[PDB]
Structure 1
């Protein structure tokens, strides 16, 4: 929230919503001027999408200790089809969704991290299931 002078805007986050320079033609016209704010629930949906698939293009810059490279990387599984098996209810389906964690270091997710990530440095590896479920960072 600090170190970022310009807000990206709701239209840049949500998918199917024409961001600032996009051509506005399809997916509802949004002039990026007085944009109708998304409800929080749909905001969570678009959020989860962006953490998964996300534009690999350069975006809003963030100076971090003197370094501003508005360049942004690509999503971790950008452009692939995920396969989740189902049952008759969400219960047994979610249970079959659990991948077998190989024996290794205990791991924790991004939303389970007691530490706030430092942008610089190496994203350390993670043998735990939270690192092979692509939710460590």
Structure 2
């Protein structure tokens, strides 16, 4: 069976502190563990990186951010723990595996159920596949002309590398076109219309440092005190199309990652 894991499979290009020659691609778990070692991890698509730094800020960061500044001058104490871990200069791998451990079997995007940032049921109710060309950026869609980025005629399209596929999926989850995508029925409801992505047409500002760990630490908005939150992949069960997108005072609702 096909399987890919963000934690173990290599997709994230990584640059080391030394030499600055031959960046190697690594998984998400490895980057997390070897963070002080690497200066940065890079994605060729700025949309892909714009959502990427958002999700990476919810993993390493969440564990370090703690999701809980109650009493004690909240802002002051989070900045105190912040100074404490910033002083350590690194994250203990055992707390990473523990986080990964909670949902270790839930990451491999190609999951039959619970695929990464995806809806698995979707396959059954949509008659026409959008196609890779409609998903991937710089790639021509059905109505798009054949002039740029290699010519894709939408007949025998060359498949995206799985690592490549991951970058695109993440971008479309951030930036995404609005109106007239392919309709899927849900108990009688068919509406090809689609609204735009949450950050669409914007510049995301991520502070950097000398090493990875620094940036990841300095990348988390301070979560105000509020309801405990979780991510789309931290959701216990699927949302369903109908109904209200519930609010989320937690930072996962402030990383625009609740839904």
TM-score by length of 1: 0.98
Report if aligned partners of 2:179, 2:192 keep a CA contact under 8 Å in 1.
no
- CA distance in 2 between counterparts of 1:2 and 1:72 reads 19
- CA distance in 1 between counterparts of 2:176 and 2:242 reads 20
User: Aligned residue pairs: how many?
Assistant: 137
- CA distance in 2 between counterparts of 1:89 and 1:132 reads 25
The residue that corresponds to 1:76 in the other structure is 198
The structure whose residues are more often helix, as a share, is: 2
Residues 66-93 of structure 1 show CA distances to partners (whole Å, capped at 9, x for unaligned) of 0100111100110110000011011101
2:179 paired with 1:57:
yes
SS of structure 2 residue aligned to 1:115: coil
SS of structure 1 residue aligned to 2:239: coil
SS of structure 2 residue aligned to 1:46: helix
Report if aligned partners of 2:174, 2:200 keep a CA contact under 8 Å in 1.
yes
Report deviation, 1:114. 1.0
Report deviation, 1:14. 0.2
The residue that corresponds to 2:240 in the other structure is 118
Report if aligned partners of 2:232, 2:258 keep a CA contact under 8 Å in 1.
yes
The residue that corresponds to 2:63 in the other structure is none
- CA distance in 1 between counterparts of 2:252 and 2:186 reads 27
Report deviation, 1:32. 0.6
Report if aligned partners of 2:198, 2:256 keep a CA contact under 8 Å in 1.
yes
- CA distance in 2 between counterparts of 1:24 and 1:65 reads 37
Moved segments of 4+, more than 6 Å? none
- CA distance in 1 between counterparts of 2:143 and 2:228 reads 44
Residues 23-62 of structure 1 show CA distances to partners (whole Å, capped at 9, x for unaligned) of 0101110011000101011111011100000001211010
Bigger radius of gyration: 2
SS of structure 1 residue aligned to 2:204: coil
Report if aligned partners of 2:183, 2:193 keep a CA contact under 8 Å in 1.
yes
The structure whose residues are more often strand, as a share, is: 2
The residue that corresponds to 2:212 in the other structure is 90
